[PDB]
Amino acid sequence: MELSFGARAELPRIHPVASKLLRLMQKKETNLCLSADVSLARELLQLADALGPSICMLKTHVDILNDFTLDVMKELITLAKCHEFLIFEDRKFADIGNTVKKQYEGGIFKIASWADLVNAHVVPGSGVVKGLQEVGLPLHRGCLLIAEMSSTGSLATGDYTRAAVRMAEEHSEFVVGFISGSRVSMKPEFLHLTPGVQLEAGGDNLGQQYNSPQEVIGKRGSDIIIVGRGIISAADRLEAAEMYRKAAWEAYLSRLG
Amino acid sequence: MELSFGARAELPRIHPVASKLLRLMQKKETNLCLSADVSLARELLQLADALGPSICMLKTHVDILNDFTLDVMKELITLAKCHEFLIFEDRKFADIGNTVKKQYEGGIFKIASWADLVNAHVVPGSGVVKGLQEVGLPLHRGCLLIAEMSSTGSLATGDYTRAAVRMAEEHSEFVVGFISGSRVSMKPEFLHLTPGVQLEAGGDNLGQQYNSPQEVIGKRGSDIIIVGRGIISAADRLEAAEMYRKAAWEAYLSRLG
Ligand SMILES: [Cl-]
Ligand SMILES: [Cl-]
């Protein structure tokens, strides 16, 4: 029934970006995405270099980097190619189609020039995807749709979640999967990435809620954990990354059987 | 029953940013917000100067400015003070609370340092507002919650819209109103701003849909029209702004009676 990441990488309808990711996940035995939530370029790059071997993906918020330049992103790409991980800018595009296309391609950040993956909220309707696609398809990029959120009071539930899945299916040339708390699509060509992950129970004072890698990957059927403060706030970020990698990978193997 | 903008500016529970806006709307006879959707700082500033007298608000997308610097925003503030309009950065914050606080205060844009108003999607739950508030309250700023969207397939309907209104009511120290297509709150302390506005019928090929100032202000009961391409794509942007101002203002006067 369920296929390994390496087999999913070969599915007929797989997106090339999804395929590249799934192959390196299998090769490196990692389904960990590092949420590199730091404000200094030097710390971003030092984390990317040290943790590169342990991660399938590095997730950025370029708009919180105090010293962003496109040269910083050049250096990140060098590390991404060296250590084999994708770069995912967690921009949560959420505007009308005509606007998101400019926000994706242009401005100071030129996100589409360096991000393998971006994400989008589905609240504006499918125009958000159509606008992003106009830039992302020519640049051979992929997009994730936010089907569920981890935070307290999330409205991404029920019919909203169903609408995100439909939108993804209907735009499979560009949409490669979901941000979600659990498996939301039965189609194995789609990736599921889940934030709100720590080994210990808890949350923060601004609505974040945590579940463990075993819960998220093993029981809820997601593919990749996105981990921020669980790693970033630790003294030894490399050991912490390895702990989360081993947790997520074994949860995956066990559910594969 | 219905109060003028100048009377609403004095309501007991009015937010100071709302009050300042409502007063200048009354003084200048304008309920037009210019969507300054351009990619060049010089064009932004030239539009702000020429159209300043006709508008209550100038709405930016700082992340599409190819030559953004904080000095550009300094010059915009000078024009805002000279001509009396507020600056609204249409950032559509839509992340967990802990992240939006950094995106609002920090990075290259330092949005909170120059934007009187920002907006937020309600999909993450009320943590999105709580996180923004932590930065915006000390800086005496206001926020608008996106209760409805103009675009085709919008999921901001029904219970989602009701949740946005509740969130606004429960955070009135920071939330000053809504982005919406119509009046969604019966409380006069809240502003309603409506995008998707042109004099002529139509839309674009990426899901934008248009309604007229008379429809939006007169029939649907909103306060302020947000107008982008209807002005920006016109040859004479000053005449176009004046046409939209007069349309929105008379629609308001008529519904006031
Ligand atoms: Cl998230
Ligand atoms: Cl909008």
Side-chain angles (χ1 to χ4, degrees), chain A residues 2-257, chain B residues 2-257:
Chain A
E2 173 132 46
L3 292 170
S4 66
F5 294 137
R8 289 169 69 189
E10 300 190 350
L11 287 161
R13 294 179 61 77
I14 205 74
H15 191 281
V17 175
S19 183
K20 177 176 181 175
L21 177 61
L22 285 158
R23 286 191 297 261
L24 65 81
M25 292 163 64
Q26 183 97 346
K27 177 187 183 181
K28 296 170 58 176
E29 302 191 328
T30 180
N31 54 333
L32 171 61
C33 174
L34 177 68
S35 179
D37 284 349
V38 299
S39 60
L40 293 179
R42 183 97 268 99
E43 192 174 7
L44 170 63
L45 296 174
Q46 285 178 175
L47 286 162
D49 195 19
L51 275 58
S54 299
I55 67 184
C56 65
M57 189 182 296
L58 189 147
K59 183 183 77 65
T60 58
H61 283 297
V62 72
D63 64 331
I64 69 171
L65 283 177
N66 290 332
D67 54 358
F68 171 85
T69 70
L70 283 169
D71 280 350
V72 174
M73 311 317 291
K74 174 176 63 57
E75 298 289 352
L76 185 61
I77 290 164
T78 296
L79 295 169
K81 290 174 181 172
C82 172
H83 297 305
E84 299 189 80
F85 57 82
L86 300 193
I87 300 167
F88 162 29
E89 165 58 37
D90 184 7
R91 177 57 182 78
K92 298 190 168 62
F93 291 104
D95 217 309
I96 69 175
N98 192 250
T99 291
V100 299
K101 66 173 173 25
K102 306 175 199 164
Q103 294 178 313
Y104 185 26
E105 188 175 44
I108 297 287
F109 296 140
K110 295 202 83 56
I111 291 167
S113 72
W114 51 263
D116 298 283
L117 297 168
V118 292
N119 57 351
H121 281 298
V122 298
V123 63
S126 69
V128 70
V129 181
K130 292 175 198 306
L132 288 174
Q133 277 181 161
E134 305 208 333
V135 173
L137 284 177
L139 287 173
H140 287 68
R141 303 308 200 182
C143 188
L144 301 161
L145 298 185
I146 300 165
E148 302 178 323
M149 294 195 66
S150 60
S151 43
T152 301
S154 170
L155 305 179
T157 63
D159 291 346
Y160 185 106
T161 302
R162 287 185 273 275
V165 175
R166 182 178 334 114
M167 197 173 296
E169 290 171 341
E170 293 179 354
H171 295 85
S172 66
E173 71 198 311
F174 183 52
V175 177
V176 304
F178 306 96
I179 301 295
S180 62
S182 67
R183 183 174 298 200
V184 292
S185 176
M186 294 314 314
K187 301 184 180 180
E189 297 79 18
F190 290 99
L191 305 160
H192 295 94
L193 288 71
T194 300
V197 177
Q198 281 212 20
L199 297 183
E200 301 287 7
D204 74 9
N205 54 8
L206 289 173
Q208 180 64 298
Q209 304 183 103
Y210 293 129
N211 285 98
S212 69
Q214 186 176 88
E215 172 65 26
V216 162
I217 301 300
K219 313 306 136 190
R220 295 179 182 193
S222 192
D223 297 316
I224 289 158
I225 57 175
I226 293 168
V227 179
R229 283 167 284 179
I231 290 165
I232 300 296
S233 297
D236 181 353
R237 274 84 78 92
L238 178 55
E239 171 175 58
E242 279 292 293
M243 294 175 76
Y244 281 96
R245 179 185 71 74
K246 289 172 185 168
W249 189 254
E250 293 302 311
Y252 155 72
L253 289 178
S254 298
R255 75 140 201 266
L256 246 193
Chain B
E2 173 132 46
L3 292 170
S4 66
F5 294 137
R8 289 169 69 189
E10 300 190 350
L11 287 161
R13 294 179 61 77
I14 205 74
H15 191 281
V17 175
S19 183
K20 177 176 181 175
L21 177 61
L22 285 158
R23 286 191 297 261
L24 65 81
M25 292 163 64
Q26 183 97 346
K27 177 187 183 181
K28 296 170 58 176
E29 302 191 328
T30 180
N31 54 333
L32 171 61
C33 174
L34 177 68
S35 179
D37 284 349
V38 299
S39 60
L40 293 179
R42 183 97 268 99
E43 192 174 7
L44 170 63
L45 296 174
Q46 285 178 175
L47 286 162
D49 195 19
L51 275 58
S54 299
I55 67 184
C56 65
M57 189 182 296
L58 189 147
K59 183 183 77 65
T60 58
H61 283 297
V62 72
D63 64 331
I64 69 171
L65 283 177
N66 290 332
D67 54 358
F68 171 85
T69 70
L70 283 169
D71 280 350
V72 174
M73 311 317 291
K74 174 176 63 57
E75 298 289 352
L76 185 61
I77 290 164
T78 296
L79 295 169
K81 290 174 181 172
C82 172
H83 297 305
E84 299 189 80
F85 57 82
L86 300 193
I87 300 167
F88 162 29
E89 165 58 37
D90 184 7
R91 177 57 182 78
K92 298 190 168 62
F93 291 104
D95 217 309
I96 69 175
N98 192 250
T99 291
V100 299
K101 66 173 173 25
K102 306 175 199 164
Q103 294 178 313
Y104 185 26
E105 188 175 44
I108 297 287
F109 296 140
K110 295 202 83 56
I111 291 167
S113 72
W114 51 263
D116 298 283
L117 297 168
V118 292
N119 57 351
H121 281 298
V122 298
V123 63
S126 69
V128 70
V129 181
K130 292 175 198 306
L132 288 174
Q133 277 181 161
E134 305 208 333
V135 173
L137 284 177
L139 287 173
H140 287 68
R141 303 308 200 182
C143 188
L144 301 161
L145 298 185
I146 300 165
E148 302 178 323
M149 294 195 66
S150 60
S151 43
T152 301
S154 170
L155 305 179
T157 63
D159 291 346
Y160 185 106
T161 302
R162 287 185 273 275
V165 175
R166 182 178 334 114
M167 197 173 296
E169 290 171 341
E170 293 179 354
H171 295 85
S172 66
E173 71 198 311
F174 183 52
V175 177
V176 304
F178 306 96
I179 301 295
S180 62
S182 67
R183 183 174 298 200
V184 292
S185 176
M186 294 314 314
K187 301 184 180 180
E189 297 79 18
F190 290 99
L191 305 160
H192 295 94
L193 288 71
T194 300
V197 177
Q198 281 212 20
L199 297 183
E200 301 287 7
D204 74 9
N205 54 8
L206 289 173
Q208 180 64 298
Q209 304 183 103
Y210 293 129
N211 285 98
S212 69
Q214 186 176 88
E215 172 65 26
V216 162
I217 301 300
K219 313 306 136 190
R220 295 179 182 193
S222 192
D223 297 316
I224 289 158
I225 57 175
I226 293 168
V227 179
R229 283 167 284 179
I231 290 165
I232 300 296
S233 297
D236 181 353
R237 274 84 78 92
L238 178 55
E239 171 175 58
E242 279 292 293
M243 294 175 76
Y244 281 96
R245 179 185 71 74
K246 289 172 185 168
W249 189 254
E250 293 302 311
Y252 155 72
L253 289 178
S254 298
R255 75 140 201 266
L256 246 193

